[PDB]
Amino acid sequence: EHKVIIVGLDNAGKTTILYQFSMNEVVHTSPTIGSNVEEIVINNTRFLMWDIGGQESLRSSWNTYYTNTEFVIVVVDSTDRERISVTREELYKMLAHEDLRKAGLLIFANKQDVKECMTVAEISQFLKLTSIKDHQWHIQACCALTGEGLCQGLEWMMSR
Ligand SMILES: Nc1nc2c(ncn2[C@@H]2O[C@H](COP(=O)(O)OP(=O)(O)O)[C@@H](O)[C@H]2O)c(=O)[nH]1
């Protein structure tokens, strides 16, 4: 009865984040008709997960899944400077969709354990987050391997 979308490039840390969220909680894979989206239920929250930037981004059939989404979590690999422009494009296409009008936006700046990664300030600048006025948003440094920063992101969602 809570619905959250979690998106990001392949290798961003999505599944690692969901593992962390699932520790000491009830978790199961909820069957989905397609092979595009994976639905992971953790307690009473349904997380809908997919990779951005592929063939499916040419179509975005997953926009049927936007209905009633409470939060969009965008996972960014803070080391992947080459591809972050792809995430940016996809973020703004999502924010334009009328079915996500009510959603809050949580950006996880993941892999902040890694030397020379982009800083949270730099990611925020690159993504123009200060431009986002019609959705509430938060950006959060994390390391999904250890879980550091994940509880802060969860609290932001729970505060809302
Ligand atoms: N160094 C580091 N590696 C990470 C972090 N989060 C995830 N990884 C690793 O990056 C790879 C991709 O992560 P994964 O969760 O499978 O990404 P997904 O494709 O978005 O689901 C795996 O080898 C993870 O162990 C992190 O915060 N720091």
Curated annotation (Swiss-Prot):
A GO CC term? trans-Golgi network
- Kindly provide the name given to this protein in its UniProt entry: ADP-ribosylation factor-like protein 5A
GO BP field:
intracellular protein transport; protein localization to Golgi membrane; vesicle-mediated transport
Please tell me the species this chain comes from.
Answer: Homo sapiens
Q: Which Pfam families match?
A: Arf (PF00025)
Q: Which GO terms describe its molecular function?
A: GTP binding; GTPase activity
General function of this protein: Lacks ADP-ribosylation enhancing activity.
Q: Which domain of life is it from?
A: Eukaryota
The record's section on PANTHER family has: ADP RIBOSYLATION FACTOR-RELATED (PTHR11711)
Protein family: Belongs to the small GTPase superfamily. Arf family.
What SUPFAM superfamilies does the entry give?
A: P-loop containing nucleoside triphosphate hydrolases
The record's keywords, sorted A to Z, are:
GTP-binding, Lipoprotein, Myristate, Nucleotide-binding
Q: Which residues form a coiled coil?
A: none
- Binding annotation for GTP: 8-15, 51-55, 110-113, 144
Among its keywords, does the record have Nucleotide-binding?
A: yes
